[PDB]
Design a protein around this ligand. Structure first.
Ligand code: MYR
Length: 121
């Protein structure tokens, strides 16, 4: 659900997920995707595509379990939708941490119809 995802982001990036990522670029994050604005914005774009190939569960609402072991998000699920969900959220979080150096506050509260239409996933 959002709690797990924001936690992962927080734990990986060290940033307040809602602040840094709640409204960042054309895809990070809360209302569809869009021509990524940069590395960070592209992370959320893949995250959404990752979301859409998900079936038995809702990624806003369904909670899953995960572990922090050796400073690594370890998914705790066998359930397929939750495992993939957990893995989509995990990878979004990694990807956001890896691209922090290009993170640009200029796109933090970007207005989202200032966004080009996204390519199908
Ligand atoms: C510290 C607990 C975190 C819960 C707050 C929710 C965080 C939401 C921001 C997640 C950023 C990517 C979201 C998305 O693109 O759907």
């Amino acid at each position: 659900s959002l709690f797990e995802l924001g936690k992962m982001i927080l734990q990986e990036t060290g940033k307040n997920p809602a602040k840094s990522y709640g409204a960042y670029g054309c895809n990070c994050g809360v209302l569809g995707r869009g021509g990524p604005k940069d590395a960070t914005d592209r992370c959320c774009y893949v995250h959404k595509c990752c979301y859409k190939k998900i079936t038995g569960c809702d990624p806003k609402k369904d909670r899953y379990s995960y572990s922090w072991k050796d400073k690594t998000i370890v998914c705790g699920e066998n359930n397929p939708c939750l495992k993939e969900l957990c893995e989509c959220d995990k990878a979004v979080a990694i990807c956001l941490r890896e691209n922090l150096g290009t993170y640009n506050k200029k796109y933090r509260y970007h207005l989202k119809p200032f966004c080009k239409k996204a390519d199908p996933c």
